[PDB]
Write a protein that binds this ligand. Structure first.
Ligand SMILES: C=CC1=C(C)/C(=C\C2=[NH+]C(=C\c3[nH]c(/C=C4\NC(=O)[C@@H](C)\C4=C/C)c(C)c3CCC(=O)O)/C(CCC(=O)O)=C2C)NC1=O
Ligand SMILES: C=CC1=C(C)/C(=C\C2=[NH+]C(=C\c3[nH]c(/C=C4\NC(=O)[C@@H](C)\C4=C/C)c(C)c3CCC(=O)O)/C(CCC(=O)O)=C2C)NC1=O
Lengths: 492, 492
């Protein structure tokens, strides 16, 4: 046999999950050349479809029937990306046949329709009403909160969570709906490393991902290498694509047996994800998944609009505050009274855990005590004094050699008056300190061979270790506001 | 009984089509008060549902079943607009019960499902494929044409057209798909009076309008007036709402027996409309219509994005063209040689049928002879020598008493040099004359008692009458470009 790489926690960061060479046993995959010649098929193809797709053969009406052949021929003879489906009866079972093409290869996926058509119609209507009602939401928090409960009410999943991804791709459960006896994961954080770059790519490219059974045994696709090119078949868009063994073990530790997740894509990146988890196997009919795929596209457009609105509104309000303060600084009797004003001062321009004003030897801390942090920052800046703007989200925490210390892990500053040490500072506390007061998801469970990290506790500890000593970073909005404020203060 | 106004061409522009007091016989309508008390019901309620909804009574589980009552209870107890539907078997038929509330009145519409779950699932999948595929179009013309052909392929309508409404609400068939034996209406124009303000409002508020059989006899609603307010029930959102007698006459003259239309709303105004016509009665199942309602919302958002992109691109191109012209005029030895350039002159900045350059007593016409027309415009402007910018879209056509005259219906004039009579003019020919180059959509048909205006040719003649002597008006973008050109030439 060829070489094989064992998937372990040390190498899973680069696991080739897009080319597993196997599919979930709830369906069968047929791979076809651009001329319709069968390149490879699944080992269970004879079990599900009752016919053998011998490589090098061509499909016939005796095998897949006329509807599948007409769909396929319309695909092979078409131009550009192809994606279609048809219903057909093969043997006794009714199969949903999904067709698509990728990297010049054509795929046919035979999925048994186990649910009744009446339920499929009702479930489609409910999904379509989500698609319609989601346009009425005024804010993304309301949207995610309402959609999570409506998605659970419709699908009946034991748990539904909405994830929102932060600047570093770390996940956060921002909304939840769950069975009464289930442990709540609301507010849990987990590191970006829990969803490898390849998985994030797949979540961005494919709007819906479904795992019918985590305890499944993959069915192989033979040959594993493409007969024409010595490379594995790229199953990136396959609906039946196998699951990584590590994610299976992770979900297994949580007792999750099935999952379905709906991606939210904004600006070409995975902005959020509705993830539905079930404690027992659960299949969602293909027409309903297609309705959720349209929901994903619509909700992504709505969330993009709502985020653009929220950003524009924050820029408007910030500009109004900035102009009001820039005027008052000249109009007021004292620049400290203006800048340090509890509501109209600089502390209201950038969301911060405190601020400090320094000018002509004068100092004043806002919402805290930051005099020594500013002093140490200046002592560091003295090694590179031409920095009129300074930005850090990872100020080094000092050793126990001093009782006073840099508890403000983040510092942002502006030198508005070089002549008299005119400095403006914004401070933020550790991103762990900003959350630890809310508790932690730490629990103990029966755990598989890979150990405790494949559990929500281990995931949260790994996040805590990643953001340890780091404050929430200054976004491009904050940096823009800071530079604009300096440009305004350059006149004063 | 109260008097009833006869709907005729003299008063049809004021017809209150939103309160017809009747519905189409393919379904039944029940009106309810906010407490669930029956206010009024359609005279066919017994024929379809098997029970009588006597005003003042309450619906019981024996009449409509628990599903309808649970949905209604949720609607009556919910806060804000309500809209939901459920599938239920009432008497001998399976119904799609659509519930909604308007002006504090609750309505229940029972529609018999004529198709099985199969076929409906396939039709819904096809509609969903359109919804997904329409996001791949990069231009509005390609979108409208492809959607028109795919909508015809799915629905099987004898004809499908895409109307695009203009600044004066006039319509134009910009795309068509039709049966081999059907007469083509591509490029037909019709006046705004063909769709009164109330019909436009309803097409904006309700994304789907269906007419199952134009030859139908409306089923009246009794009582005719709301017992709580003594006013007619507002059916603006009802899907069974009756059709005006005059549009039934119009479609009867066209030989059309059924119609379905999908609205395209951009900026809160009816931007366009896909209309499907059938030569025989045709019903579209409710789940499929809800799929097309989501298609209408998605298509409206896509068309809005595409039109915004096209407008921004036109502003970019116009800016570059204006700057290029200014540079060439600065580098050219003779300003006339640059301004009269066929590809980079004033004729390239604004869509026009002709232009004229005048300066220091020099005159030069572009794309034809406009010297005497410009002379007459100056004669009109000489009455107000302070007018530096003038535009008109209804230039009075001179009589036959002169061999030459103002043969231009549109005139846009700008003065860039008061001392040197520096003037720029753009001219546009009659809109009818502009269309006549593409053919004449006129034919004769059998006509009804309202006479020839309720025919496609009658609508074309009425449009010709409405735009006679008028050119396409100068839009805000054209005026902005013209003003910027004026300022740039003043700088030069
Ligand atoms: C309380 C719950 C909880 C969860 C579910 C969580 C993380 C999380 N993993 C996700 C997916 C994947 N993760 C890995 C691989 C790795 N898994 C690891 O743990 C490290 C060692 C590792 C690589 C270095 C792969 C291949 C996939 C793709 C699976 C596929 O679809 O084939 C997702 C996506 C959405 C979802 O599944 O709900 C989430 C949200 N964190 C928590 O606290
Ligand atoms: C060759 C084809 C062709 C067409 C189809 C055309 C006109 C046209 N009428 C439309 C609708 C309506 N018109 C009127 C009323 C008036 N109709 C008139 O003729 C004058 C007298 C009048 C009032 C003063 C009303 C109440 C409705 C609403 C009907 C309802 O209840 O749903 C539409 C919408 C789309 C559609 O119907 O497919 C179009 C496109 N003009 C053409 O050349």
């Amino acid at each position: 046999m060829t070489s094989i790489t064992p998937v372990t926690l040390a190498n899973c960061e680069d696991e080739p999950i897009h080319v597993p060479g196997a599919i979930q046993p709830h369906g069968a995959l047929v791979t076809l050349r651009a001329d319709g010649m069968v390149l490879a098929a699944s080992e269970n193809i004879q079990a599900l479809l009752g016919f053998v797709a011998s490589p090098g053969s061509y499909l016939t009406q005796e095998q897949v029937g006329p509807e599948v052949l007409r769909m396929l021929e319309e695909g092979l003879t078409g131009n550009g990306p192809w994606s279609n489906s048809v219903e057909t009866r093969i043997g006794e079972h009714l199969f949903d046949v999904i067709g698509h093409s990728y990297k010049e290869v054509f795929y046919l996926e035979f999925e048994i329709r186990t649910a009744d058509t009446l339920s499929i119609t009702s479930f489609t209507l409910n999904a379509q009403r989500i698609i319609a009602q989601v346009q009425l939401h005024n804010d993304t928090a309301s949207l995610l909160s309402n959609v999570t409960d409506e998605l659970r009410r419709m699908t009946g999943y034991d748990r539904v969570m909405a994830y929102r991804f932060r600047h570093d791709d770390s996940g956060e459960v921002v909304a939840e709906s769950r069975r009464e006896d289930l442990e709540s994961y609301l507010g849990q954080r987990y590191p970006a490393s829990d969803i490898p770059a390849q998985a994030r790519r797949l979540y961005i490219q494919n709007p819906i991902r479904l795992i019918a059974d985590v305890a499944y045994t993959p069915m192989r696709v033979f040959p594993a290498l493409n007969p024409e090119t010595n490379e594995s078949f790229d199953l990136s868009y396959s609906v039946l694509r196998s699951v990584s063994p590590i994610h299976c073990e992770y979900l297994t530790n949580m007792g999750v047996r099935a999952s379905m997740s709906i991606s939210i894509v904004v600006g070409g990146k995975l902005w959020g994800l509705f993830s539905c988890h079930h404690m027992s196997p659960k299949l969602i009919p293909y027409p309903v998944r297609m309705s959720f795929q349209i929901f994903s596209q619509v909700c992504s457009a709505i969330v993009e609009r709502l985020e653009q609105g929220r950003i524009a509104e924050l820029l408007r309000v910030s500009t109004e505050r900035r102009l009001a303060l820039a005027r008052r600084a000249r109009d007021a009797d004292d620049l400290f009274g203006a800048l340090a004003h509890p509501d109209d001062g600089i502390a209201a321009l950038i969301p911060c855990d405190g601020a400090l004003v320094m000018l002509g030897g004068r100092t004043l801390s806002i919402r805290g005590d930051f005099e020594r942090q500013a002093g140490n920052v200046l002592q560091r800046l003295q090694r590179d004094p031409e920095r009129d703007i300074y930005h850090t989200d990872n100020w080094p925490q000092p050793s126990e050699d001093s009782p006073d210390g840099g508890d403000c892990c983040g510092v942002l500053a502006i030198r508005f008056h070089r002549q008299e040490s005119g400095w403006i500072f914004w401070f933020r506390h550790e991103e762990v300190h900003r959350i630890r007061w809310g508790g932690k998801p730490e629990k103990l469970l029966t755990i598989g061979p890979s150990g405790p990290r494949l559990t929500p506790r281990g995931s949260f500890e790994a996040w805590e270790e990643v953001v340890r000593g780091h404050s929430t970073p200054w976004s491009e909005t904050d940096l823009a506001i800071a530079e604009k404020l300096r440009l305004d203060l350059m006149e004063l």
